[PDB]
Symmetry: D3
Amino acid sequence: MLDNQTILITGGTGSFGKCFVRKVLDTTNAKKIIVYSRDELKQSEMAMEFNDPRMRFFIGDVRDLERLNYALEGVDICIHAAALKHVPIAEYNPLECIKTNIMGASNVINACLKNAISQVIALSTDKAANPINLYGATKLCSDKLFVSANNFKGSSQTQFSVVRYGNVVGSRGSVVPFFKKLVQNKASEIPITDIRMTRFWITLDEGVSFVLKSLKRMHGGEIFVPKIPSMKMTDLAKALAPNTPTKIIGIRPGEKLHEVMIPKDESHLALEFEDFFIIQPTISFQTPKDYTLTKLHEKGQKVAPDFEYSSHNNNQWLEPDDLLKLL
Amino acid sequence: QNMLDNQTILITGGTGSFGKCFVRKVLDTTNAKKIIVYSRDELKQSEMAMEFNDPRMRFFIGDVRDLERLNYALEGVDICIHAAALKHVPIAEYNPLECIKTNIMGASNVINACLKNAISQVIALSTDKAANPINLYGATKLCSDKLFVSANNFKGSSQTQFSVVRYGNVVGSRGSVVPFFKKLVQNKASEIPITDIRMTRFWITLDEGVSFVLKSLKRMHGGEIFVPKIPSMKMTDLAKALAPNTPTKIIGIRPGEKLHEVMIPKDESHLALEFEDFFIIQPTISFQTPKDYTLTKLHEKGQKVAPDFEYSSHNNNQWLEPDDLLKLL
Amino acid sequence: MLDNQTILITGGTGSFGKCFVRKVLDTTNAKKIIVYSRDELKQSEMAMEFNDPRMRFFIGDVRDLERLNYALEGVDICIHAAALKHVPIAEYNPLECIKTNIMGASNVINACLKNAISQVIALSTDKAANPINLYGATKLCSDKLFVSANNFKGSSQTQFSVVRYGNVVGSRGSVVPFFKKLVQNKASEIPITDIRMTRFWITLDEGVSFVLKSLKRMHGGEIFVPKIPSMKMTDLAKALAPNTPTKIIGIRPGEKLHEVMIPKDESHLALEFEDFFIIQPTISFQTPKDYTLTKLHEKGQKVAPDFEYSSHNNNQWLEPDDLLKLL
Amino acid sequence: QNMLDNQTILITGGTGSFGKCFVRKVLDTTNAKKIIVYSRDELKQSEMAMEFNDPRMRFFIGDVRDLERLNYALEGVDICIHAAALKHVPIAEYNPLECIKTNIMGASNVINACLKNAISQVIALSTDKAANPINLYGATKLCSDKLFVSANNFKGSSQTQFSVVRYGNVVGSRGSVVPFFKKLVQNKASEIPITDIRMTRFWITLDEGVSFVLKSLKRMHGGEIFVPKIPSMKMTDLAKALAPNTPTKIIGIRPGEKLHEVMIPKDESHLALEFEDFFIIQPTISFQTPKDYTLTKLHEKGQKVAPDFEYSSHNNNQWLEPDDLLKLL
Amino acid sequence: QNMLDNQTILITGGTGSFGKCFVRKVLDTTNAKKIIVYSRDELKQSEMAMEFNDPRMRFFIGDVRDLERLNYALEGVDICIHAAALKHVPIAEYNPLECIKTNIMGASNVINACLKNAISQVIALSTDKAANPINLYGATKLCSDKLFVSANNFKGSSQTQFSVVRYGNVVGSRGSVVPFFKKLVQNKASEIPITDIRMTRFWITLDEGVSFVLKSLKRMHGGEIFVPKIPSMKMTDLAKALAPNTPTKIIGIRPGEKLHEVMIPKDESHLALEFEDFFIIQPTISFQTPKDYTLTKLHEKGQKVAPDFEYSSHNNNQWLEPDDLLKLL
Amino acid sequence: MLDNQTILITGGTGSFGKCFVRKVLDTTNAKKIIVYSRDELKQSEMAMEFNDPRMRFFIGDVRDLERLNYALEGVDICIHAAALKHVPIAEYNPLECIKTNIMGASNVINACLKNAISQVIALSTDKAANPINLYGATKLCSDKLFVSANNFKGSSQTQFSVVRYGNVVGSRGSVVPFFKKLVQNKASEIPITDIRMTRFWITLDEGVSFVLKSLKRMHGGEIFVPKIPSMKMTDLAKALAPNTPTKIIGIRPGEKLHEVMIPKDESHLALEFEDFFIIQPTISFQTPKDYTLTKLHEKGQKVAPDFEYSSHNNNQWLEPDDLLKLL
Ligand SMILES: NC(=O)c1ccc[n+]([C@@H]2O[C@H](COP(=O)([O-])OP(=O)(O)OC[C@H]3O[C@@H](n4cnc5c(N)ncnc54)[C@H](OP(=O)(O)O)[C@@H]3O)[C@@H](O)[C@H]2O)c1
């Protein structure tokens, strides 16, 4: 697997960013881990915490093609986690979200090919499946680009895969942590936008690991989807602090009732496995790939024609307590 | 008596299906100062100036990907129709940045330019595929719509209005399938492509839409996404039409090709406002200057819709008999 | 010659475009033929007609440098036929014509060098010789650039030559076909701008072949000119449909009486051959070339000091019938 | 009494031959608010501010290839003289994109900028070499002229006028041959470069032209290409001048160097309009606002020319005795 | 009664130290129509809209490196505060183009945009490090200041005024050392970083400065570089403060880190104009419209300074007792 | 040392430009010397004077990245002397100076890495030390960039060093030559801005040689400073023409009393040698370098803590005559 390799991750100062740097640091022999991002304050703060010579911090934007080409020189593997993810903000700053996510993905793809990187994994989201909001629309474009990149074939081959998973239990500005800062500062209530608000749930750590495993499976072109549990927002408001009331607030700008992981119209392209899924590409590559046998010799089978992985039509569900056991 | 009296109109990509018809319909039914055709191809542009040979026409070579050009293009324009785009779904799947550069950046430039020149009203053309999309093409179009709607916040003494008209397939449009169904049974009728037996699609006429735009243009406030109520046509039947009897062949689902097109999402119904013959999906954001979309600028009143409604082609009420289409062919 | 090679042709959806793709398909072992152009409707229509796995369609503009670099990866030979050729339109859209033809030629030249292509042939026109209209002015710049490209010398050598020939008998929006669509739709007349209107004439097929032969001759830097026949526009109006009258119409915007192939002031740089000519470069290359012995061991001699290849001062002439035999 | 009263003038590349003279001529004979010199080189610009030391001067460092800069440059200008360019023919042959970037894109930016700032009149400098060209330099200049003339269509409340002044060699200009003929017989007279015995060229004075511009500036409508009637000087004679007797040497025809310069094409004569001391090649296209180029804005009337006319240097009527030039040296 | 009455203010990078405080101070003490926060990070922007939850706020995602965006940003703004920047000296040393792209090109775009939108007054934030600099960061800031001052020449009916406010360290600002001195003795007090025993620095309060800007904003003409008179605090003492007693450790001089910060150069004193509580370094160039910087727009008179003066931190007169800082902490 | 190498120098039509081309031409076996600059008139004039096939003139701007990449193909060593150096003009055209000097330096750095050049020497100035004027501020950024470039490490290594020296005795538009053109044209006076105006002095030739030697010493990352003499402007006005009076004129826009070569706060990073100095980098390179032993096995030692190389606190001084002996 990974050994004496160089890894560059865009937006490595983010949640997935550090939780991933940490895990690669501790569980692998990655010769050098490179964080590529824009803020000097987070990288100054992040260099002092990860006080290890295995690191290296490059200040740069993904909207910058030259910089990326410079930053990716000599890199072996690349994880793309840079992005504007705040759905409401994206609705008010649509070009900003487009520049960062779409153009950003394109430049990363380019710089990777030029530097002959070996493997690239971009981070998607369930919001990119049958999307309604801008953020998701841009992300779907990003996935489309990354999958399509597997067609280029220069004097250097590069595999481009995508990992798509749900809401990361408690993250920089989320819900579960929000539903505590309140009760702490005397929360007058517990706002619940709706009773049907379902959502796939995964942890920072579960995510970081499904990624490092995809690298071990991937042929390039796949869109790996993990089989994660769903949790009714009704049974979550409880845990967090049933005590206080729950003033319904309606619906934020761009929210869905439930999130989709694998569209119904994607069924055919799906292949079930044990812990995960794979949404085979839609286009054909000059060099065909057999997405039925991972590079880990794991065998996967198709799915029923009327297949779809909704957040609610799911069968797994996080007990109204389990999320406290995780807190 | 509402009209586009003595006005300069510019339509991007008006060298194709929608464009040629809209350019014809406007010259015929309205008295607009002039009409500018903005497109890249010199052949089509030349074979259009002849085709029309009308003094109220002007032709500009140009790419929507070009901002300095669009800036000079729109100079002196009152109304802009954005119909330029890459719509060939499977090709968009293989050439994703192309589709992105034209449809996403393209929409952005047309906007940037329209505002610079203080255009009055702008209507952008979307597709049913931009609703809960799954193919790249549709995803760029969803982005596109978002941009034009978001464009309504900008507040300068320009006050441009941006709206979107989203509808489905056009009964035999510039190289599609209807003609590619004749074209075949119009040569060696013995093999007809198919994908599914449940495969449905909304079908509007290359004219029902054109007029729908001119109409949406007359009753807009800005920020709307007008949806024309149309009939759904299950493919199977659409088969016996362009070939009463022939050995059809079930090829395969082309890349990124859905199975049931959505016109209005299930998760956005709370934004829709039903009307007698059309729909209006209100902005998912709030503008500085709010508006009551329940009242078209034509007075037309509107009531919302069932909090669960999902205007899908399959769950459509009306349909088209394999003869109602013959009455189109 | 060409074998197991990859060929990319800009504007391959055009007249010369398909007639060339077809001929390479049928007469060579070209491993892969790549069409590079902007319209999806022509490439969708062109893929279904040339239903052959030897093809590959890239949607792109020549005004786009990144795309070209991507498109030319792994290509062996490149034919440049993309361009805005409508003279009147170019007079009203001068920057458009300049961007496409000049900047377009420059980007193609660049992408070719970066990808180490071996041979590049750009298509010129007689309108580029002692030009008067914009279209021709841009084309002369394109020829100048391509010839000059033979001076670059990186870890990869690339030959850049130009093929310059006249009006292609009946083409997408021309005269001879125009002078029939009329008589068909009851042509009231036959418009003849002038009695001296001479023009070199060649066929789509003759052109496509002189190109594939130049590749076999070329050293890089030459501007091959075929010896084609001239035809008085007076004796052409006849054939097409003498029947109807000929309402003289004057002179279109930018038209010449006759077209030049090899300028008088180019004499010195000329070298006569059997079927063709060669207009040796004006500049000297780091690595001299002997344009007297093609790579086909064909020997050519200079021309008289007062030499010039006008369309009228020519000696060959297409009988007022021959063009019907060709129709 | 026509003047450039209290006006701001900006000349691109006015740090060279034409520029320095025009800058001098305008300060001396007219009362224009100010004069802006726009060029790249700091040395020449500094050695010019001293050289002139005039308060009505302003110097801006800048490349015509730079659009944002040109935009700030022309801000507040009424008249623009575009004299910036790469004219060294053989060098242009070896560095074709350079010449292209400066002469073609350069002309485009100066235009884009002039219109943005609503400049009143713009005169661009062309060369005889842009007539039925064969060298790159001249070909960029033909493109250039086309651009400035085409620039007259644009219709905004700016109404800028764009014209072109095309003439030949300037009797001993910034490093040419006349001085490089002295410079030699001005050191070791024993070897003089030559190309042909029929080699002819039009010759105007670095002052006859400058004034011709100021004049063309006073009688323009826009879209014209003014041609100054000048004398032709067969090289041979021009030899005995800058060296009565010396062993000249026939080197060789430099790259892209013609043998007979054309001022007006044979295929464009039908556009020319002959005048007492100059010519006017009318646009090869039609503008929205037509104009009668037969009447200079100075009332000067004009009759066309013989439908075959080809103002060539060799077929020129007047010439220059090997002493008329001495009366220039 | 001077105020920023009913005015739209936009501050670049107002999502950080200075910004948040300035945004707070202005809302609290003045009645300005609205306030626009222009920055790149969505997290900080969201955690600020909540943090403030004030209707007179607006947040725009954006990079100062982006000119088209800045152009739309500043649209409709009267006053602009440029506080966006990369200031982490040693990081700037390792990523020099980054710092350059943001601080140099960044300042240029904010200017280009401000003029385009006819902003009234613009104040740019500089640092003491831009005085006789040696580190990249400070060198970009010197360039930066030069740009904003030079920006005062441009003369269009816009008449924007550009000034600069340059001061030193901010007593415990967004991750610096003061807090990183607590943070340590606030966990395992046994090792404190040090560089020299002569190491001095000027120290102003994150509030003394903010107000200084609002004040400099009220008494500016344009082209000035306002310098606030502040106290110097020799580091040694600053040590016993954030840790009465602990085993400090002399690590090493971080890259590009000076030893004595300069507020006013020795070679520029002849430009300074001393005031009761501040300084004004006049432009090193002459503008078309001269100004008497000896008279603030607040009437405040000013006398120059000793022709040798060099406002250095070490040669400072006033200082701060290791308790005056405690009275800050 | 240098042999069969290719050298490209930006702004080779300048003072240092020709004096360097000449010296490399005469004292080395440089296979090919390439001049890269913008003006055709200087390069036309410069090709005729340096009438040697070892030359090659490329017309280009440093503000142009493509061109540079083209121009630097196959180059071994690169000297960067292009720049806007007129301090007053830079104060009025600050963006022009920034584009040329800073962006220019960045593009040169980029093109060099892409072409795998081996060594690059950029020319600094004493004005970049503790600067006050724009010109110097941009130059300090240029030095910072060049030093930092030594961190990139692609499939090709490139050393980037800087040479920083004072006013070049009599140059295109300077003082000493100015103080003669006057007396020649009847100089009414001798303007002396101040009595303390000190300045380091070096010759075109001394400079050109310290450069060619640095190439022989350099490890990459150094900022070589030669130990040159200082001259009081009071004792210089004399020589030039004591005869005429000396009307004091004040202080130009951006001038200092004295110029610094090695800042006081740079002491620690300094290393004294015989004829020169070295200001070790401020940052650490992935691959450490020992700046105490040049590549010429020359040993250098540090300097006292209170060290600084001012133009006045200097000990060497050019006799009020020596500059006439040099004239
Ligand atoms: N005399 C002739 O041979 C002749 C005859 C007919 C027509 N013309 C035309 O008249 C015009 C002026 O000729 P001239 O004899 O005065 O030539 P010149 O002495 O070479 O002056 C040309 C000027 O253009 C400037 N320039 C060059 N590139 C520039 C750029 N990229 N951006 C901005 N300025 C640039 C140069 O200034 P910097 O180098 O400091 O940038 C120079 O001052 C030319 O356009 C030429 O085509 C010349």
